[PDB]
Structures are given as structure tokens and as C-alpha cells.
Amino acid sequence: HMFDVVVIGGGISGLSAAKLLTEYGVSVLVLEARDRVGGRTYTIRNEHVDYVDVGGAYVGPTQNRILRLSKELGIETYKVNVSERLVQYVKGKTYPFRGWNPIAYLDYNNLWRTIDNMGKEIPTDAPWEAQHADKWDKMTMKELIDKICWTKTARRFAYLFVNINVTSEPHEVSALWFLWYVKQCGGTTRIFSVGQERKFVGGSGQVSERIMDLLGDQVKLNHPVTHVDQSSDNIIIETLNHEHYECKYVINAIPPTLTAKIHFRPELPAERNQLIQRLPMGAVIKCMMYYKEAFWKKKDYCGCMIIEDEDAPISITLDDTKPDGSLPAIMGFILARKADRLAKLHKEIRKKKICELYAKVLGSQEALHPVHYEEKNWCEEQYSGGCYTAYFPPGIMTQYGRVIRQPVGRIFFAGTETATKWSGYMEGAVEAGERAAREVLNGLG
């Protein structure tokens, strides 16, 4: 019942906070809505797959927080095999290699150059302060692309870059925000690696699980927080089943839209009440297709494909075979408006649709005979809102966004949507948690 801090939510962010706080001898309790920790990271384990991340999986270099943490937790990593030739799919046929129009590629990298130069103006700690904030916030990321790119290849190809990175549609997202977003990953280069990718040996879900190991029964599953009352020195916290917990500080560690569902006494300041209200989550279905053999490797196909076809389920693919070569698999995201559209469908109908995409992208009959299939659809995510992260619609960043990680009395704000480096990724979840934890620490001693 009685603790120094309560952490709302036990994804990587809430758990990171909790662990640091624990390192300093602070009494922490974690209330977590689900019957598992890990949130948007989730490793399904079953005899068909051994294990598989249906959520966040990939960590890059430069991402030292989650690397240091996982390493401490005793979790190894492995290099995602980007073995052979990448395949792009455009306008029916398919092309193997780099990106093939001159003037259009001169357009290509000019766009990524511009996006970065534009990045320079935007303070990562406060994008709302950018000299050109207003112009850029009013502006949709689609019009920006159009205003910059002279050709429709670049333009089209860019839309899909936006799709892949923020699971959303260009017309729906603030230019300011997107430009910030990329910048805060180290810019165009880093974010989307032409490209040392890694996954955790055994699942990214381990990061959370192992911290729950450290915390024991101070992590409470099936405890969705519904009220936070702050009005009297001791903070009373209520969960769905009308259990009560009291503590001296709170750390909100759940995404904006979800924070909005909690009842706050006193109310959150009007400004913030609006912000958290207006950042929608993105939309993805993550899909692992399993095959008896790694047939794509055999045709010198990497197994990673960038698909920019109108009516094709999957938009981007990666090989996902185990580090030793057992249980060959192809991981694909079906995302943004495609996710919304195909979410309706039965799992089995997606599986067939997907298989025949692969058949004709890979020109192989064996793509039609999967051995097993796993997917989580994150749109339909009650305790997540969606993946990978929250986006900013136009004008929102500057109307309310300033207040994005500011305390209210004794309530502090974590969650990857509040990081200033790799916001939206597992890395960002850590940065957030830890930052929030330290904030609480200063509010002590």
C-alpha cells in the first residue's frame, strides 16, 4: 500500500524509471494494466517460433541507453542479417540493389539534404522554439515534400519513408514535428539505415521481464490506473478494481492518449489536458511469415523488400530467421492507411494476401506454403493506442506541445513520447524513464 513513488505503466519506460529509482534505495511500485510487462514490446513464445518480438525489436548503434541496460540485465544482441540484395517493388515489376532515374535521384538526396538542413534550425529540447516554428507547424509533411521535390518518383518514394518511420500519412503530420523527429534520431542517415540493425537474443520483451525480476512483487499486473488524486500531500492512486495505493510522487509512463483517460484531482492544466488529448497513435500490423527453408537467401535475395505499390499489404520487409538459421521467416510491416484498411480483415485473409505478395516480389512459388504465421495488430491495442508512436498533427506542436514533459505538482512524465533522443523507439523509452526518475530524485533529500 505505501511507497515513495508509483510508476503508471510497466513498459520499458516506466520500468527504467523504477529500476534507477530502486538503484538509489527509493521505494517504488509499478501499476501495469496488462497481465504482462513490456507494453509495445512483446515477445510471443511458442513451440512454432521458439520466441518472436511482435512489437519493438530493432536497436541500432548510437542507441546506448537500451544497450547499456540490456547488457546489464544480461541480454545479448545479434546483427540482423542484411545478407544479400534488397528488392524494391514499384509499378508491377521488381528491382534488386541500392535505392534508377538520374534527375529523380538528384531530387532524391536533395530532399534528404534539405530535411537535415531544416533540422539544424530546430532545438531538439524544444522544437516549438524553432525560428520557423509557425510556418512549419501549419504545414503538412505532404506539402513540404511536394514544395521541395520536383518529381513524382521522389515525392512518392518519400511518402513511403514517412509511412515506414512514423506509421502515418504525410497529409496527417506536422512538418515541424516530422523534421524534429528525424533530427532527434541523428538525421536521415541514422534513422533509416541503407545498415547495422540488431535484435535481442531471445526477445526485446526480456528487458522488461528482467526488471520485473529485480522488482519482485512491487510490480502489479492487471492494475490499470484510473484515478490520481494529488490534493493532499499524500497521493491517493486508484486502479480499475478500486484498489488504493499512496505515495509521495507519481511518474506517468503511458502514452498521451492513454494518460488522457485517467481522472486527475486536481485537473491537469487546460493546455496539457488538450495536448495529450490530440496526439493520435500511428497504425501498424506486424507480420512474421514462417517457412520450412530460407528460400529467399537461396535466390541471393536478402529477404528485405521496400514495396511502394498501391494495393500491396506489406510496405517493408526484413529477414527474421533465428541467429543460427533455424525457423526461417520474413518480417513485414503493413502500416499507416494500409493498416487501417486491412485491420478489418481476418488474420487468415491477411496471411494469404501477404503470401502472394511475397510470391510475386520474390518470384517464388514456395512463398505460398508458409509453415506458421504470427502477427499483432497494434491499431486494435487497448493499452497502447497503436505503434510505433504518437504523431503530431499540424499546429498542435506549437499550440500545446511546449508542455510535453513538464511536471504537474508531483506528477512527472515519462514514456518514449517524451524523449529527446530516439523518441518513439525503445531507446527513447529508456531516456524518458531515466530522466523522469532523476527529476523525482531532486524532488527529494
Ligand X SMILES: *[C]C1=C([C])[C]=[C@@]23C(=[C]1)N([C][C]([O])[C]([O])[C]([O])[C]OP([O])(=O)OP([O])(=O)O[C][C]1O[C](N4[C]=NC5=C4N=[C]N=C5[N])[C]([O])[C]1[O])C1=NC(=O)[N]C(=O)C1=N2C3#C[C]N([C])[C][C][C]OC1=[C][C]=C(Cl)[C]=C1Cl
Whether cis (ω within 30° of 0) applies to the bond prior to 266 is yes
| 94 neighbors 304 (Cβ within 8 angstroms) | no
Assign 317 to helix, strand or coil.
Answer: strand
- CA dihedral of residues 213, 214, 220, 221 (deg, nearest 10): -30
The span of 153-161, 211-219, 361-369, 426-434 binding ligand X (CB under 6 A) equals 426-434
Site mask for ligand X (CB under 6 A), range 372-401, x = bound = ------x----xx--xxx------------
Interatomic CA distance for residues 413 and 397, integer angstroms: 17
Site mask for ligand X (CB under 6 A), range 179-208, x = bound = --------------x-x-x-----------
Beta strands in 158-299 (DSSP E): 198-200, 219-220, 225-229, 235-239, 244-252, 263-265, 284-290
Measured from the CB atom, is 139 or 254 closer to ligand X? 254
Site mask for ligand X (CB under 6 A), range 298-317, x = bound = ------x-----------x-
Assign 302 to helix, strand or coil.
Answer: strand
The span of 3-11, 150-158, 209-217, 340-348 binding ligand X (CB under 6 A) equals 3-11
Among 6, 20, 40, 413, binds ligand X (CB under 6 A): 40
# chain residues binding ligand X, by CB under 6 A: 48
Measured from the CB atom, is 81 or 398 closer to ligand X? 81
| 287 neighbors 332 (Cβ within 8 angstroms) | yes
Among 19, 34, 248, 405, binds ligand X (CB under 6 A): 34
Considering only residues 253-272, where is the footprint of ligand X by CB under 6 A? 253-255, 258, 262
| Residues with Cβ within 8 Å of residue 268, at least 6 apart in sequence | 276, 408
Q: Which residue is associated with the grid cell 526488471?
A: 211
Among 51, 58, 78, 264, binds ligand X (CB under 6 A): 58
CB atoms within 10 A of CB 30: 27
List contacts with ligand X (CB under 6 A): 8-14, 31-34, 39-41, 55-59, 164, 193, 195, 197, 224-225, 253-255, 258, 262, 284, 286, 304, 316, 318, 378, 383-384, 387-389, 415-416, 424-427, 429
